């Protein structure tokens, strides 16, 4: 249900935050996942291409440091930002390729 | 969720990158808006609560530096992440405020 003045931006954000809950049916969810875990999840969740250059390296070292650490939603954010900045959907990603 | 075999996580990312285009009409966008502009636009898009403390500071100065300048999706990402860090909607999201 909904009855709030949401807008597409808000909707994107509410989707992300709720998706930590609706991860793959996940009760007792804390914040986000673990850091390396996250890296392995995103490459799965994004089947599209994984061309990943530039921030690939940045993120790789960031995980390498202490991936044992928990990730948290705000940091997750930056990291998937970097992931978009890496894996740039050509236009119509849902096309798969053709 | 979609049909290539992409998951809800990736689903959110395509929605964000889309929504730069589906912002407020232009014949194909660049990367994001101007920094300051971006901050006001997200404020407008998120009427939800706007309690904004913590990353209010990080983000305020981050904008201030050269807030005029063109923002790109990379920076934008972190910044809306910080916005989630700030407005920690969490539970009472669709509950709005009143």
UniProtKB/Swiss-Prot annotation, chains A, B:
Location(s), subcellular: Cytoplasm; Secreted
Binding site residues for Ca(2+) 1: 32, 37
Major subcellular site: cytoplasm
Any Gene Ontology biological process: mast cell degranulation
GO molecular function: calcium ion binding; calcium-dependent protein binding; copper ion binding; fibroblast growth factor binding; lipid binding; protein homodimerization activity; RAGE receptor binding; zinc ion binding
EF-hand domain: residues covered: 18-53
Keywords carried by this UniProt record: Calcium, Copper, Cytoplasm, Lipid-binding, Metal-binding, Phosphoprotein, Protein transport, Repeat, Secreted, Transport
Top-level taxon in the UniProt lineage: Eukaryota
Residues with PTM Phosphoserine: 32
Binding of Ca(2+) 2, residues: 64, 66, 68, 70, 75
Cellular component, GO, one term: extracellular space
Tissue and organ expression note: Expressed in heart and skeletal muscle.
Function, in words: Plays a role in the export of proteins that lack a signal peptide and are secreted by an alternative pathway. Binds two calcium ions per subunit. Binds one copper ion. Binding of one copper ion does not interfere with calcium binding. Required for the copper-dependent stress-induced export of IL1A and FGF1. The calcium-free protein binds to lipid vesicles containing phosphatidylserine, but not to vesicles containing phosphatidylcholine.
Quaternary assembly: Homodimer. Part of a copper-dependent multiprotein complex containing S100A13, FGF1 and SYT1. Interacts with FGF1 and SYT1. Interacts with IL1A.
Protein name, as recorded: Protein S100-A13
Species whose genome carries this gene: Homo sapiens
Gene designation per UniProt: S100A13
């Amino acid at each position: 249900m909904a009855a709030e003045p949401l807008t597409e931006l808000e909707e994107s954000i509410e989707t992300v935050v709720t998706t930590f809950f609706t991860f793959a049916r996940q009760e007792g969810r804390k914040d986000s996942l673990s850091v390396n875990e996250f890296k392995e999840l995103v490459t799965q969740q994004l089947p599209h291409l994984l061309k990943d250059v530039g921030s690939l390296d940045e993120k790789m070292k960031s995980l390498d440091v202490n991936q044992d650490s928990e990730l948290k939603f705000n940091e997750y954010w930056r990291l998937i930002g970097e992931l978009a900045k890496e894996i740039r959907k050509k236009k119509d990603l849902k096309i798969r390729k053709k």
